[PDB]
Structures are given as structure tokens and as C-alpha cells.
């Protein structure tokens, strides 16, 4: 019949949880880090718990803390 052969267009780290391997779209807590990199609140303090550099910005991601322990 039977088509549209369909995207939205404009998909590059825009929304993307590069974490939980699992892409956003809509009301989702993101948080970036200072080392532009955008990704979810949730799973960003998941990962980034015991690591806390970006692999290739070289920038050190807790930007202060400032916690302990
Ligand atoms: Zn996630
Ligand atoms: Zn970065």
C-alpha cells in the first residue's frame, strides 16, 4: 500500500542513556556532566559512582565532592 520508510531524522547523543544502553524521549531526569557529556540521572550516579572521568574529554567529572566516604 504501504509505506513510510520513517525516522525522525536527528538522533546523535541528543537524549540517549549510554548507561542503561536505552534512549530517552520525554520527562526524563538527564543531568550532564561538566565535561559535556549528557546522560540519565539515575544511571549516570550508577556508573559513575566509583569512576568519575570522562574517557575521552579527560575532565574530572565530581567537580567537587565534597562527600566522604
Ligand atoms: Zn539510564
Ligand atoms: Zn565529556
Redesign the pocket.
Known amino acids: 500500500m504501504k509505506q513510510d520508510g520513517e525516522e525522525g531524522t536527528e538522533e546523535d547523543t541528543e537524549e540517549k542513556?549510554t548507561?542503561?544502553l536505552?534512549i530517552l524521549e520525554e520527562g526524563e531526569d538527564v543531568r550532564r556532566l561538566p565535561c559535556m557529556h549528557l546522560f540519565?540521572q539515575?544511571?549516570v550516579d550508577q556508573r559513575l559512582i566509583t569512576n568519575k572521568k570522562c574517557p575521552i574529554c579527560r575532565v574530572d567529572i565530581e567537580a567537587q565532592l565534597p562527600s566522604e566516604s
Open positions: 542513556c548507561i542503561c536505552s540519565h539515575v544511571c
